[PDB]
Amino acid sequence: EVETFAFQAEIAQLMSLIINTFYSNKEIFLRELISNSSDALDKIRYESLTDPSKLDSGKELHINLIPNKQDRTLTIVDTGIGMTKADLINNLGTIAKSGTKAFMEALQAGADISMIGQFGVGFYSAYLVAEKVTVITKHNDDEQYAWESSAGGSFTVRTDTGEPMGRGTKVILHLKEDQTEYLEERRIKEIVKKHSQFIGYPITLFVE
Ligand SMILES: O=C(c1ccc(O)cc1)c1ccc(O)cc1O
């Protein structure tokens, strides 16, 4: 059972801007996704301070970066709070309509695409390097779901019968053919050191 949804006009506009605008500094996508993972980990950490049972679904708070050259995918896994089905459908827990408006207003006032995260829609920077994005998520209060979009104005949501993940979010980037540098260990290390060196959770870069 796959459900197909249309993106709200503003998000479709945001995604088309990210995909079609000439902008060479694409590496910021990884900073933005690690930042989202850090935010999700902060949320489960805070909830666990008053209710330790929230961590029954996994006590480890971390971020894993997994490149796969054969599948041409870069996966970002975290053990954060995860998202309910409602949150996934409602623009992956973001204020994407107002955020997109504020980001568009900023771009007109001199901002550049790298400032996207300041407007709460950093997730969509994944489309700087990915032709398709799959998001697998599990929140303590709901089932495991898979969201997917190749942009083009729609996304799908389905129950995930894949590997159970306990709690958190997995962002699978199906990279564009000319963006395979983001599968190279030295390139990923360089970006993490440049943009995410002080993130408060362990970031483990897997090897193949
Ligand atoms: O699961 C989330 C998330 C992020 C923020 C928040 O307030 C609640 C859930 C998530 C969303 C996007 C992403 O790239 C990574 C993630 O862990």
Domain ranges of the chain: 1-208
Whether 112 has a binding-site annotation, put simply, is: no
How far, in whole angstroms, is CA 190 from its chain's centroid?
Answer: 19
DSSP 7: P
Closest atom, ligand 1, to C-alpha of 37: 17
Measured in degrees and rounded to the nearest 5, phi and psi for residue 204 equal: -110, 120
Can you tell me the distance from the alpha carbon of 186 to that of 190, in angstroms, rounded to the nearest whole number? 6
189 token code pair: 């290390």
Q: What is the resolution of this structure in A?
A: 1.8
156 three-state secondary structure: strand
The residue assigned the tokens 């910021």 is 28
- From the list 35, 13, 168, 175, the residue with the least C-alpha distance to 91 is 13
Whether 198 has a binding-site annotation, put simply, is: no
Q: Which amino acid is at 72?
A: R
Q: Quick one: 63 exposed, middle or buried, by C-beta within 10 A (0-12, 13-18, 19+)?
A: buried
Question: Alpha carbon of 56 to those of 44, 81, 145: distances in Å?
Answer: 11, 12, 19
Question: Alpha carbon of 181 to those of 27, 41, 68, 74, 187: distances in Å?
Answer: 10, 28, 12, 10, 7
Question: Alpha carbon of 45 to those of 39, 40, 82, 201: distances in Å?
Answer: 10, 9, 12, 11
Closest atom, ligand 1, to C-alpha of 92: 11
The residue assigned the tokens 């060479």 is 24
Distance 190 CA to ligand 1 centre (A): 23
Distance 70 CA to ligand 1 centre (A): 27
Q: Which CATH architecture describes the domain 1-208?
A: 2-Layer Sandwich (3.30)
Distance 129 CA to ligand 1 centre (A): 19
The technique by which this structure was obtained is X-ray
Distance 14 CA to ligand 1 centre (A): 19
The residue assigned the tokens 């900073």 is 31
Question: Alpha carbon of 8 to those of 5, 61, 69, 118: distances in Å?
Answer: 9, 33, 33, 20
Q: Is 41 in the pocket of ligand 1 (CB under 6 A)?
A: no
Residue located nearest, by CA, to atom 13 of ligand 1: 36
**CB contact set of 108 (below 8 Å; sequence gap of 6+):** none
Give me the sign of the Cα torsion angle 124, 125, 130, 134. negative
